[PDB]
Amino acid sequence: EALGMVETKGLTAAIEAADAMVASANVMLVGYEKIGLGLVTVIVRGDVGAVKAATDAGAAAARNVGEVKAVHVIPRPEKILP
Amino acid sequence: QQEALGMVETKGLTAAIEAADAMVASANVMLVGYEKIGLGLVTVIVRGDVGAVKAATDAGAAAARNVGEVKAVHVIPRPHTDVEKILPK
Amino acid sequence: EALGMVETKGLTAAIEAADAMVASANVMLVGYEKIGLGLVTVIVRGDVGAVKAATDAGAAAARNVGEVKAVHVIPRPEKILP
Amino acid sequence: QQEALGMVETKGLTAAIEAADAMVASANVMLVGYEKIGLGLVTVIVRGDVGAVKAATDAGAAAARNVGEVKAVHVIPRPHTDVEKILPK
Amino acid sequence: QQEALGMVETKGLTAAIEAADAMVASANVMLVGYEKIGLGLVTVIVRGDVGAVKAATDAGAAAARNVGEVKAVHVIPRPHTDVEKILPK
Amino acid sequence: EALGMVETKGLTAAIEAADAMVASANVMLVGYEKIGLGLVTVIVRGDVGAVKAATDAGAAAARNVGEVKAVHVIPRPEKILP
């Protein structure tokens, strides 16, 4: 049960990422995190395969809207989230 | 391709309220809400038909431009079963 | 029943605007909004005439304290506020 | 011209607490509170007589300057019926 | 010199979650939590033995560097009676 | 019963200051304050002597981690805090 995240500059690029990820595979949206400097992180949860597929599609879709600052998959054993 | 989310991201809140007003008066769109992400950035979100949403965002963006900076303008067509599920809310 | 707003860089310029607007005409102070980057929006509600008079006086008074970033009147039919 | 609001806006919180202390010890002014607006900006607000408020803000600004940056210093004379009504509180 | 606090401060949240994961898998350290201070800065805090904490922070910092910027890496040895008392929590 | 504070750029430098202050003298940690721009203020309370000793040690320790923006002691008569 992996965690996946797309970090963007702008919220529009983050919602675009969230839409692309959930349509792409069997992943559940955990939520959003605002850390300032116009930075928003979109977090998904699901099996490793579904998470890797979702983040690649979420990053590719956000890229067309705004600047993607980070794309990452953590195949974890939600304790690690804020 | 029937249901959609629309957004106008501005630098300044006045430009965002101006966008929200122009959107709802220009097309058959319902205001979902606002989001503050820091750096003076505010996102205005609307919901309605893809055609209505594309028309609202173009009018929202044009009206906000007269007040402040518009940083982003975007339309996301949605499945219609859980249109608002992808929003932070 | 119009909405009026003065957006400033600095809070002192915003409180100065709020004071000038409420003394100028029959307008009710809705509140303040902080959006970061030192930006503060002062919002008033009242009839269109009273709102246009208040915002012109609020902008002119704030100008003497700090930098006014936006001045606007919306003659609306509070649903549109955050 | 009898009741007034006073403010000292600083870059840094230490300079703001230093201003608040200098204000209350220098003149017959009551501390209303603080406001954080981002960009490291903090506003200290005082209430009292116009004369006392002008004297407190000058001492608050001078004391804060030794600690940090002072971005704004201002006095607003108020009607006395609803002195604090204009504040965000 | 037995109990310690460790921290990795990053620009970006993804780099912070990556640090948190690398820390807990690399050494016998417990994740305390996160702190957002603005400017896109996030601090990840761990608790454990001084040796384990120095090993976790080095692995957390190295793993975060592959994702984003690491702004600070630090180890604070603690008395063991009230290890977490100094944290903002 | 004085107030003492160390203002830093970064949270790590602030926690380092808090640790150095509490070990240095008989001072109680009031708390932390985040004002944005990566600025964090660490506040202590105790007798004037203990507070002056704590802030000097807290500033010296933070200096080795990050940039200290302010160091100050107020020998007060907690009303003055946010």
Side-chain angles (χ1 to χ4, degrees), chain D residues 39-75:
Chain D
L39 223 72
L41 305 167
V42 184
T43 303
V44 188
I45 312 171
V46 297
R47 188 199 171 171
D49 329 74
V50 68
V53 164
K54 215 157 261 185
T57 66
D58 277 357
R65 267 152 191 157
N66 290 318
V67 175
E69 270 187 60
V70 178
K71 306 288 269 185
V73 190
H74 197 234
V75 174

PDB file of all heavy atoms in Angstrom, chain D residues 39-75:
ATOM      1  N   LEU D  39       4.817  37.581   5.463  1.00  0.00           N
ATOM      2  CA  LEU D  39       6.003  38.325   4.982  1.00  0.00           C
ATOM      3  C   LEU D  39       6.847  38.800   6.198  1.00  0.00           C
ATOM      4  O   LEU D  39       7.639  39.743   6.092  1.00  0.00           O
ATOM      5  CB  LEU D  39       5.598  39.513   4.050  1.00  0.00           C
ATOM      6  CG  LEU D  39       6.424  39.733   2.782  1.00  0.00           C
ATOM      7  CD1 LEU D  39       6.142  38.660   1.742  1.00  0.00           C
ATOM      8  CD2 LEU D  39       6.128  41.087   2.176  1.00  0.00           C
ATOM      9  N   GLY D  40       6.660  38.117   7.332  1.00  0.00           N
ATOM     10  CA  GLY D  40       7.306  38.423   8.600  1.00  0.00           C
ATOM     11  C   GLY D  40       6.780  39.689   9.241  1.00  0.00           C
ATOM     12  O   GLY D  40       7.427  40.236  10.130  1.00  0.00           O
ATOM     13  N   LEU D  41       5.596  40.171   8.800  1.00  0.00           N
ATOM     14  CA  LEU D  41       4.981  41.403   9.279  1.00  0.00           C
ATOM     15  C   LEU D  41       4.000  41.195  10.423  1.00  0.00           C
ATOM     16  O   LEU D  41       3.082  40.374  10.327  1.00  0.00           O
ATOM     17  CB  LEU D  41       4.325  42.196   8.130  1.00  0.00           C
ATOM     18  CG  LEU D  41       5.202  42.546   6.924  1.00  0.00           C
ATOM     19  CD1 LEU D  41       4.342  43.039   5.765  1.00  0.00           C
ATOM     20  CD2 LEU D  41       6.294  43.565   7.283  1.00  0.00           C
ATOM     21  N   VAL D  42       4.219  41.950  11.514  1.00  0.00           N
ATOM     22  CA  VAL D  42       3.431  41.925  12.748  1.00  0.00           C
ATOM     23  C   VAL D  42       3.007  43.375  13.063  1.00  0.00           C
ATOM     24  O   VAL D  42       3.852  44.272  13.066  1.00  0.00           O
ATOM     25  CB  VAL D  42       4.217  41.297  13.951  1.00  0.00           C
ATOM     26  CG1 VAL D  42       3.335  41.183  15.202  1.00  0.00           C
ATOM     27  CG2 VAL D  42       4.829  39.944  13.596  1.00  0.00           C
ATOM     28  N   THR D  43       1.717  43.584  13.359  1.00  0.00           N
ATOM     29  CA  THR D  43       1.182  44.908  13.731  1.00  0.00           C
ATOM     30  C   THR D  43       0.780  44.867  15.198  1.00  0.00           C
ATOM     31  O   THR D  43       0.085  43.946  15.632  1.00  0.00           O
ATOM     32  CB  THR D  43       0.021  45.323  12.804  1.00  0.00           C
ATOM     33  OG1 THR D  43       0.487  45.305  11.467  1.00  0.00           O
ATOM     34  CG2 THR D  43      -0.515  46.725  13.093  1.00  0.00           C
ATOM     35  N   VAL D  44       1.264  45.836  15.961  1.00  0.00           N
ATOM     36  CA  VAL D  44       0.954  46.002  17.377  1.00  0.00           C
ATOM     37  C   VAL D  44      -0.038  47.156  17.444  1.00  0.00           C
ATOM     38  O   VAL D  44       0.230  48.212  16.868  1.00  0.00           O
ATOM     39  CB  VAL D  44       2.225  46.307  18.197  1.00  0.00           C
ATOM     40  CG1 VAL D  44       1.915  46.294  19.679  1.00  0.00           C
ATOM     41  CG2 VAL D  44       3.311  45.307  17.884  1.00  0.00           C
ATOM     42  N   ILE D  45      -1.190  46.944  18.111  1.00  0.00           N
ATOM     43  CA  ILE D  45      -2.244  47.951  18.216  1.00  0.00           C
ATOM     44  C   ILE D  45      -2.503  48.379  19.655  1.00  0.00           C
ATOM     45  O   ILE D  45      -2.660  47.535  20.541  1.00  0.00           O
ATOM     46  CB  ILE D  45      -3.540  47.515  17.469  1.00  0.00           C
ATOM     47  CG1 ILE D  45      -3.220  46.988  16.034  1.00  0.00           C
ATOM     48  CG2 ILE D  45      -4.569  48.661  17.438  1.00  0.00           C
ATOM     49  CD1 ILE D  45      -4.384  46.310  15.227  1.00  0.00           C
ATOM     50  N   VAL D  46      -2.542  49.702  19.872  1.00  0.00           N
ATOM     51  CA  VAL D  46      -2.816  50.347  21.167  1.00  0.00           C
ATOM     52  C   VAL D  46      -4.048  51.261  21.116  1.00  0.00           C
ATOM     53  O   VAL D  46      -4.434  51.734  20.046  1.00  0.00           O
ATOM     54  CB  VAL D  46      -1.592  51.050  21.818  1.00  0.00           C
ATOM     55  CG1 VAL D  46      -0.480  50.039  22.141  1.00  0.00           C
ATOM     56  CG2 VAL D  46      -1.078  52.208  20.951  1.00  0.00           C
ATOM     57  N   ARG D  47      -4.656  51.499  22.287  1.00  0.00           N
ATOM     58  CA  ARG D  47      -5.838  52.350  22.429  1.00  0.00           C
ATOM     59  C   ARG D  47      -5.653  53.295  23.629  1.00  0.00           C
ATOM     60  O   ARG D  47      -5.162  52.892  24.679  1.00  0.00           O
ATOM     61  CB  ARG D  47      -7.102  51.481  22.586  1.00  0.00           C
ATOM     62  CG  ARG D  47      -8.408  52.244  22.549  1.00  0.00           C
ATOM     63  CD  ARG D  47      -9.522  51.430  23.166  1.00  0.00           C
ATOM     64  NE  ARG D  47     -10.738  52.226  23.344  1.00  0.00           N
ATOM     65  CZ  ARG D  47     -11.913  51.725  23.701  1.00  0.00           C
ATOM     66  NH1 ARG D  47     -12.050  50.422  23.917  1.00  0.00           N
ATOM     67  NH2 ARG D  47     -12.962  52.520  23.848  1.00  0.00           N
ATOM     68  N   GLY D  48      -6.053  54.540  23.446  1.00  0.00           N
ATOM     69  CA  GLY D  48      -5.980  55.580  24.465  1.00  0.00           C
ATOM     70  C   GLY D  48      -6.260  56.942  23.871  1.00  0.00           C
ATOM     71  O   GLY D  48      -6.746  57.043  22.729  1.00  0.00           O
ATOM     72  N   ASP D  49      -5.937  58.002  24.643  1.00  0.00           N
ATOM     73  CA  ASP D  49      -6.091  59.399  24.241  1.00  0.00           C
ATOM     74  C   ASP D  49      -5.170  59.714  23.062  1.00  0.00           C
ATOM     75  O   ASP D  49      -4.052  59.217  23.040  1.00  0.00           O
ATOM     76  CB  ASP D  49      -5.781  60.351  25.421  1.00  0.00           C
ATOM     77  CG  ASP D  49      -6.124  59.770  26.780  1.00  0.00           C
ATOM     78  OD1 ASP D  49      -5.359  58.869  27.262  1.00  0.00           O
ATOM     79  OD2 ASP D  49      -7.176  60.160  27.341  1.00  0.00           O
ATOM     80  N   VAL D  50      -5.632  60.542  22.091  1.00  0.00           N
ATOM     81  CA  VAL D  50      -4.860  60.932  20.892  1.00  0.00           C
ATOM     82  C   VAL D  50      -3.408  61.375  21.196  1.00  0.00           C
ATOM     83  O   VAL D  50      -2.475  60.914  20.532  1.00  0.00           O
ATOM     84  CB  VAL D  50      -5.664  61.865  19.916  1.00  0.00           C
ATOM     85  CG1 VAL D  50      -5.915  63.228  20.523  1.00  0.00           C
ATOM     86  CG2 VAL D  50      -4.988  62.000  18.553  1.00  0.00           C
ATOM     87  N   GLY D  51      -3.248  62.182  22.248  1.00  0.00           N
ATOM     88  CA  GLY D  51      -1.967  62.679  22.715  1.00  0.00           C
ATOM     89  C   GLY D  51      -1.098  61.553  23.240  1.00  0.00           C
ATOM     90  O   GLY D  51       0.076  61.462  22.879  1.00  0.00           O
ATOM     91  N   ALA D  52      -1.682  60.660  24.068  1.00  0.00           N
ATOM     92  CA  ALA D  52      -1.033  59.498  24.674  1.00  0.00           C
ATOM     93  C   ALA D  52      -0.660  58.503  23.580  1.00  0.00           C
ATOM     94  O   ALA D  52       0.442  57.968  23.581  1.00  0.00           O
ATOM     95  CB  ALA D  52      -1.977  58.852  25.681  1.00  0.00           C
ATOM     96  N   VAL D  53      -1.573  58.288  22.609  1.00  0.00           N
ATOM     97  CA  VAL D  53      -1.359  57.373  21.484  1.00  0.00           C
ATOM     98  C   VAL D  53      -0.222  57.863  20.555  1.00  0.00           C
ATOM     99  O   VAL D  53       0.610  57.058  20.161  1.00  0.00           O
ATOM    100  CB  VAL D  53      -2.673  56.991  20.769  1.00  0.00           C
ATOM    101  CG1 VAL D  53      -2.408  56.382  19.403  1.00  0.00           C
ATOM    102  CG2 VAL D  53      -3.505  56.037  21.617  1.00  0.00           C
ATOM    103  N   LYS D  54      -0.149  59.162  20.254  1.00  0.00           N
ATOM    104  CA  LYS D  54       0.933  59.722  19.435  1.00  0.00           C
ATOM    105  C   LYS D  54       2.284  59.572  20.165  1.00  0.00           C
ATOM    106  O   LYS D  54       3.279  59.229  19.523  1.00  0.00           O
ATOM    107  CB  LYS D  54       0.659  61.198  19.116  1.00  0.00           C
ATOM    108  CG  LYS D  54       1.136  61.618  17.738  1.00  0.00           C
ATOM    109  CD  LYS D  54       0.363  62.860  17.242  1.00  0.00           C
ATOM    110  CE  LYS D  54      -0.771  62.540  16.275  1.00  0.00           C
ATOM    111  NZ  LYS D  54      -1.409  63.766  15.717  1.00  0.00           N
ATOM    112  N   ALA D  55       2.301  59.770  21.509  1.00  0.00           N
ATOM    113  CA  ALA D  55       3.494  59.595  22.339  1.00  0.00           C
ATOM    114  C   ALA D  55       3.925  58.109  22.418  1.00  0.00           C
ATOM    115  O   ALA D  55       5.125  57.829  22.322  1.00  0.00           O
ATOM    116  CB  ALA D  55       3.264  60.156  23.730  1.00  0.00           C
ATOM    117  N   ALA D  56       2.961  57.157  22.544  1.00  0.00           N
ATOM    118  CA  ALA D  56       3.273  55.715  22.612  1.00  0.00           C
ATOM    119  C   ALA D  56       3.855  55.196  21.311  1.00  0.00           C
ATOM    120  O   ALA D  56       4.883  54.545  21.329  1.00  0.00           O
ATOM    121  CB  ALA D  56       2.039  54.906  22.972  1.00  0.00           C
ATOM    122  N   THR D  57       3.226  55.516  20.180  1.00  0.00           N
ATOM    123  CA  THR D  57       3.701  55.063  18.869  1.00  0.00           C
ATOM    124  C   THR D  57       5.112  55.561  18.540  1.00  0.00           C
ATOM    125  O   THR D  57       5.865  54.806  17.950  1.00  0.00           O
ATOM    126  CB  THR D  57       2.667  55.299  17.754  1.00  0.00           C
ATOM    127  OG1 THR D  57       2.479  56.699  17.560  1.00  0.00           O
ATOM    128  CG2 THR D  57       1.339  54.596  18.011  1.00  0.00           C
ATOM    129  N   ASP D  58       5.472  56.798  18.932  1.00  0.00           N
ATOM    130  CA  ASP D  58       6.804  57.359  18.700  1.00  0.00           C
ATOM    131  C   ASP D  58       7.850  56.606  19.509  1.00  0.00           C
ATOM    132  O   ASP D  58       8.948  56.393  19.003  1.00  0.00           O
ATOM    133  CB  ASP D  58       6.854  58.863  19.033  1.00  0.00           C
ATOM    134  CG  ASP D  58       6.365  59.788  17.924  1.00  0.00           C
ATOM    135  OD1 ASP D  58       6.029  59.285  16.827  1.00  0.00           O
ATOM    136  OD2 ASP D  58       6.326  61.016  18.149  1.00  0.00           O
ATOM    137  N   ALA D  59       7.508  56.201  20.758  1.00  0.00           N
ATOM    138  CA  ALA D  59       8.380  55.431  21.670  1.00  0.00           C
ATOM    139  C   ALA D  59       8.448  53.957  21.267  1.00  0.00           C
ATOM    140  O   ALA D  59       9.516  53.359  21.365  1.00  0.00           O
ATOM    141  CB  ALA D  59       7.902  55.558  23.109  1.00  0.00           C
ATOM    142  N   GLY D  60       7.322  53.403  20.802  1.00  0.00           N
ATOM    143  CA  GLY D  60       7.234  52.029  20.328  1.00  0.00           C
ATOM    144  C   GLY D  60       8.089  51.848  19.094  1.00  0.00           C
ATOM    145  O   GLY D  60       8.885  50.904  19.024  1.00  0.00           O
ATOM    146  N   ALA D  61       7.971  52.806  18.137  1.00  0.00           N
ATOM    147  CA  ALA D  61       8.733  52.811  16.881  1.00  0.00           C
ATOM    148  C   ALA D  61      10.253  52.940  17.145  1.00  0.00           C
ATOM    149  O   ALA D  61      11.032  52.192  16.552  1.00  0.00           O
ATOM    150  CB  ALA D  61       8.249  53.927  15.954  1.00  0.00           C
ATOM    151  N   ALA D  62      10.655  53.855  18.057  1.00  0.00           N
ATOM    152  CA  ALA D  62      12.051  54.094  18.438  1.00  0.00           C
ATOM    153  C   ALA D  62      12.695  52.875  19.121  1.00  0.00           C
ATOM    154  O   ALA D  62      13.864  52.574  18.862  1.00  0.00           O
ATOM    155  CB  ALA D  62      12.139  55.308  19.337  1.00  0.00           C
ATOM    156  N   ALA D  63      11.930  52.177  19.981  1.00  0.00           N
ATOM    157  CA  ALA D  63      12.378  50.982  20.695  1.00  0.00           C
ATOM    158  C   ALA D  63      12.481  49.750  19.763  1.00  0.00           C
ATOM    159  O   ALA D  63      13.456  49.000  19.859  1.00  0.00           O
ATOM    160  CB  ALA D  63      11.446  50.687  21.852  1.00  0.00           C
ATOM    161  N   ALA D  64      11.495  49.555  18.870  1.00  0.00           N
ATOM    162  CA  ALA D  64      11.481  48.464  17.902  1.00  0.00           C
ATOM    163  C   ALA D  64      12.670  48.576  16.935  1.00  0.00           C
ATOM    164  O   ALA D  64      13.302  47.562  16.655  1.00  0.00           O
ATOM    165  CB  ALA D  64      10.170  48.464  17.128  1.00  0.00           C
ATOM    166  N   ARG D  65      13.008  49.816  16.480  1.00  0.00           N
ATOM    167  CA  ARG D  65      14.125  50.134  15.568  1.00  0.00           C
ATOM    168  C   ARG D  65      15.480  49.603  16.032  1.00  0.00           C
ATOM    169  O   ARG D  65      16.343  49.298  15.205  1.00  0.00           O
ATOM    170  CB  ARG D  65      14.209  51.639  15.313  1.00  0.00           C
ATOM    171  CG  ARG D  65      13.437  52.052  14.071  1.00  0.00           C
ATOM    172  CD  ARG D  65      12.925  53.476  14.137  1.00  0.00           C
ATOM    173  NE  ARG D  65      11.981  53.738  13.050  1.00  0.00           N
ATOM    174  CZ  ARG D  65      11.057  54.691  13.066  1.00  0.00           C
ATOM    175  NH1 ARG D  65      10.937  55.490  14.120  1.00  0.00           N
ATOM    176  NH2 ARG D  65      10.238  54.845  12.036  1.00  0.00           N
ATOM    177  N   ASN D  66      15.657  49.482  17.352  1.00  0.00           N
ATOM    178  CA  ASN D  66      16.867  48.955  17.956  1.00  0.00           C
ATOM    179  C   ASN D  66      16.938  47.427  17.842  1.00  0.00           C
ATOM    180  O   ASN D  66      18.030  46.854  17.915  1.00  0.00           O
ATOM    181  CB  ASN D  66      16.974  49.404  19.425  1.00  0.00           C
ATOM    182  CG  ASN D  66      17.255  50.870  19.612  1.00  0.00           C
ATOM    183  OD1 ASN D  66      18.069  51.476  18.904  1.00  0.00           O
ATOM    184  ND2 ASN D  66      16.624  51.462  20.613  1.00  0.00           N
ATOM    185  N   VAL D  67      15.780  46.772  17.653  1.00  0.00           N
ATOM    186  CA  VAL D  67      15.647  45.314  17.532  1.00  0.00           C
ATOM    187  C   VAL D  67      15.526  44.864  16.062  1.00  0.00           C
ATOM    188  O   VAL D  67      16.248  43.973  15.626  1.00  0.00           O
ATOM    189  CB  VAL D  67      14.467  44.788  18.396  1.00  0.00           C
ATOM    190  CG1 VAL D  67      14.256  43.296  18.181  1.00  0.00           C
ATOM    191  CG2 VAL D  67      14.684  45.097  19.880  1.00  0.00           C
ATOM    192  N   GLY D  68      14.589  45.460  15.338  1.00  0.00           N
ATOM    193  CA  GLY D  68      14.340  45.120  13.946  1.00  0.00           C
ATOM    194  C   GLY D  68      13.902  46.283  13.095  1.00  0.00           C
ATOM    195  O   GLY D  68      14.106  47.449  13.452  1.00  0.00           O
ATOM    196  N   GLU D  69      13.305  45.952  11.959  1.00  0.00           N
ATOM    197  CA  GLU D  69      12.793  46.923  11.012  1.00  0.00           C
ATOM    198  C   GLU D  69      11.420  47.344  11.436  1.00  0.00           C
ATOM    199  O   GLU D  69      10.606  46.507  11.836  1.00  0.00           O
ATOM    200  CB  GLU D  69      12.665  46.287   9.621  1.00  0.00           C
ATOM    201  CG  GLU D  69      13.891  46.405   8.743  1.00  0.00           C
ATOM    202  CD  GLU D  69      13.637  45.917   7.330  1.00  0.00           C
ATOM    203  OE1 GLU D  69      12.756  46.488   6.644  1.00  0.00           O
ATOM    204  OE2 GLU D  69      14.317  44.953   6.912  1.00  0.00           O
ATOM    205  N   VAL D  70      11.147  48.632  11.314  1.00  0.00           N
ATOM    206  CA  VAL D  70       9.816  49.182  11.522  1.00  0.00           C
ATOM    207  C   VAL D  70       9.345  49.546  10.112  1.00  0.00           C
ATOM    208  O   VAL D  70      10.041  50.272   9.398  1.00  0.00           O
ATOM    209  CB  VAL D  70       9.799  50.382  12.489  1.00  0.00           C
ATOM    210  CG1 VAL D  70       8.382  50.952  12.639  1.00  0.00           C
ATOM    211  CG2 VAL D  70      10.375  49.987  13.847  1.00  0.00           C
ATOM    212  N   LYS D  71       8.210  48.985   9.692  1.00  0.00           N
ATOM    213  CA  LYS D  71       7.672  49.207   8.359  1.00  0.00           C
ATOM    214  C   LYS D  71       6.630  50.313   8.316  1.00  0.00           C
ATOM    215  O   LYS D  71       6.545  51.014   7.306  1.00  0.00           O
ATOM    216  CB  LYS D  71       7.154  47.896   7.734  1.00  0.00           C
ATOM    217  CG  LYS D  71       8.199  46.763   7.731  1.00  0.00           C
ATOM    218  CD  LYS D  71       9.355  46.946   6.725  1.00  0.00           C
ATOM    219  CE  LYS D  71       9.065  46.310   5.392  1.00  0.00           C
ATOM    220  NZ  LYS D  71      10.238  46.397   4.484  1.00  0.00           N
ATOM    221  N   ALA D  72       5.864  50.500   9.408  1.00  0.00           N
ATOM    222  CA  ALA D  72       4.826  51.538   9.487  1.00  0.00           C
ATOM    223  C   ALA D  72       4.551  51.972  10.920  1.00  0.00           C
ATOM    224  O   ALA D  72       4.709  51.182  11.860  1.00  0.00           O
ATOM    225  CB  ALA D  72       3.536  51.057   8.824  1.00  0.00           C
ATOM    226  N   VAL D  73       4.202  53.261  11.078  1.00  0.00           N
ATOM    227  CA  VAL D  73       3.869  53.928  12.347  1.00  0.00           C
ATOM    228  C   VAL D  73       2.679  54.827  12.019  1.00  0.00           C
ATOM    229  O   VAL D  73       2.786  55.708  11.145  1.00  0.00           O
ATOM    230  CB  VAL D  73       5.042  54.768  12.930  1.00  0.00           C
ATOM    231  CG1 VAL D  73       4.724  55.227  14.339  1.00  0.00           C
ATOM    232  CG2 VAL D  73       6.357  53.998  12.919  1.00  0.00           C
ATOM    233  N   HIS D  74       1.533  54.592  12.681  1.00  0.00           N
ATOM    234  CA  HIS D  74       0.332  55.373  12.398  1.00  0.00           C
ATOM    235  C   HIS D  74      -0.635  55.543  13.568  1.00  0.00           C
ATOM    236  O   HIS D  74      -0.731  54.687  14.450  1.00  0.00           O
ATOM    237  CB  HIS D  74      -0.374  54.786  11.178  1.00  0.00           C
ATOM    238  CG  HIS D  74      -1.368  55.683  10.530  1.00  0.00           C
ATOM    239  ND1 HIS D  74      -2.661  55.266  10.314  1.00  0.00           N
ATOM    240  CD2 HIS D  74      -1.229  56.945  10.071  1.00  0.00           C
ATOM    241  CE1 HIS D  74      -3.274  56.282   9.736  1.00  0.00           C
ATOM    242  NE2 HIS D  74      -2.455  57.323   9.587  1.00  0.00           N
ATOM    243  N   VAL D  75      -1.319  56.705  13.577  1.00  0.00           N
ATOM    244  CA  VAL D  75      -2.316  57.117  14.568  1.00  0.00           C
ATOM    245  C   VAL D  75      -3.613  57.433  13.868  1.00  0.00           C
ATOM    246  O   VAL D  75      -3.627  58.175  12.883  1.00  0.00           O
ATOM    247  CB  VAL D  75      -1.851  58.272  15.469  1.00  0.00           C
ATOM    248  CG1 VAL D  75      -2.985  58.739  16.382  1.00  0.00           C
ATOM    249  CG2 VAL D  75      -0.607  57.857  16.289  1.00  0.00           C
TER     250      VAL D  75
END
